[PDB]
């Protein structure tokens with residue numbers, strides 16, 4: 001398989017209609033957020049893309065979210081996948097909605113792709129066409145702007161990144177040097193959206209280059 | 215198996231009767247501690263519970279102790295398990311004693327339990343009936359007080375925690391948000407001991423809930 | 429196998445002849461460094477030893493380099509191994525040279541050794557006879573001085589370290605307490621070179637002790 005999509009799956013999900021007040025204080029949750037949606041999943045960068053997407057479909061924001069040390073392959077149980085997102089809303093109906101934009105997007109939104117027919121190397125070269133509060137809460141991102149979200153193993157990623165800046169006028173806005181918790185590297189770029197698509201292509205060209213050879 | 219106990223095992227053990235002075239300075243060890251017991255083990259939270267228990271049976275304190283990035287399943291060798299505790303004493307007899315309270319407690323003290331008959335999800339819902347200097351050295355714990363020590367994969371843990379505060383008047387004293395080094399989450403609660411047992415039950419009810427469904 | 433060598437392998441490699449200026453700024457790269465060599469590999473401490481060795485054969489320095497959370501066994505793809513080194517030079521010929529000192533040294537330089545015939549425990553007890561800018565950039569290392577670089581799982585390492593200070597006048601210069609990203613421990617010692625070899629021996633005696641028993 002060329003760059004056949006990798007179908008992420010949801011690993012667990014629950015809503016706390018009404019957080020205990022004590023647990024809530026420990027979370028630093030605003031007064032306006034008394035319901036939480038919790039969601040685990042197979043693929044972490046995708047789940048962070050679904051989360052942000054939930055921020056646009058519903059009235060929620062992500063209270064929390066972080067990944068697992070050596071990936072889902074190594075996860076501590078079939079439940080935790082390799083991410084945990086914690087959405088907060090003013091009530092349970094808003095949070096359900098955010099939960100369902102997240103599921104529909106994890107199952108059928110952004111996706112990693114195989115780097116090689118051998119399906120032992122994966123990557124993500126995905127245009128987020130309009131950013132919500134999650135992705136745009138990060139340094140230097142404008143709310144509502146387009147963005148590229150690029151991920152690949154360490155050497156793959158560094159090269160492919162360079163390649164991308166060289167292929168399209170974009171702005172490297174964020175760079176996770178190589179060892180993220182899951183052991184990949186990523187960066188966020190910005191510019192137009194037809195450019196975050198020129199950029200998005202050279203990155204995959206460069207990841208496919210290393211796979212086949214480098 | 216329902217919540218059949220998981221029998222932790224000790225992976226290695228040695229006493230340095232008399233630390234090199236140079237190694238000692240690098241450890242920031244008091245003047246009153248010239249002997250070290252080193253101990254590795256299968257199950258990290260249990261080993262931290264055994265350590266604290268050693269602080270009560272013998273004159274030692276834990277000089278060090280930390281866990282391994284993706285769990286014992288992923289450990290770097292059959293030796294290191296997924297924890298390393300370093301006990302310090304005024305001499306080798308004290309430290310042996312602490313080492314032996316630790317072994318007897320790792321092998322037959324606190325224990326994880328299976329979340330599901332499928333034995334792919336584990337958790338820990340254990341009352342520490344009286345805390346020594348290790349567990350009580352942590353923020354807001356009283357020396358000699360009771361405590362609950364709750365651990366579970368990320369979504370399991372968050373939910374189960376909320377559940378517990380809601381089931382018994384306890385105090386969330388410490389909270390390790392989701393990705394600890396081993397990829398679980400935990401929290402310490404306090405109150406009575408019959409309550410750290412009401413709390414300890416809803417947590418397991420809530421972990422069993424997600425296993426079977428959520 | 430006694431302490432049969434473990435043959436590290438290179439997992440990927442590429443040169444960016446000319447970094448994009450934007451990517452370069454994000455790297456904090458000097459004005460004197462416009463070419464990068466990227467290199468991934470099987471064995472991280474060895475690769476950090478090869479890197480430093482490249483600093484002596486060629487005009488390059490390491491711009492970056494870090495390891496992967498649970499080791500190459502758990503790496504995110506067959507490419508990233510468990511390290512990423514990023515060499516910088518004034519041009520592509522210098523960097524090629526550094527890349528080739530690194531390959532020749534990863535494939536046939538420093539090496540882990542099996543702790544036990546069972547080949548489930550590994551370690552590294554290697555004299556770096558003269559240090560370049562990489563290893564010597566670390567606290568308290570003199571440029572051009574000899575050094576011991578000792579690595580072993582957590583309990584193995586702590587013991588073996590103590591053992592080494594006790595066997596030869598050396599100076600513990602750096603100590604990575606137990607859980608490095610790859611889940612081993614290491615330390616750098618200094619003194620003579622016949623001593624960093626007395627030290628280097630007791631460490632392996634002590635790692636072999638735990639393997640067979642402790």
Ligand SMILES: [Hg+2]
Nearest residue numbers: 127147148196
């Ligand atoms: Hg893009």
Ligand SMILES: [Hg+2]
Nearest residue numbers: 341361362410
């Ligand atoms: Hg309890």
Ligand SMILES: [Hg+2]
Nearest residue numbers: 555575576624
């Ligand atoms: Hg040495």
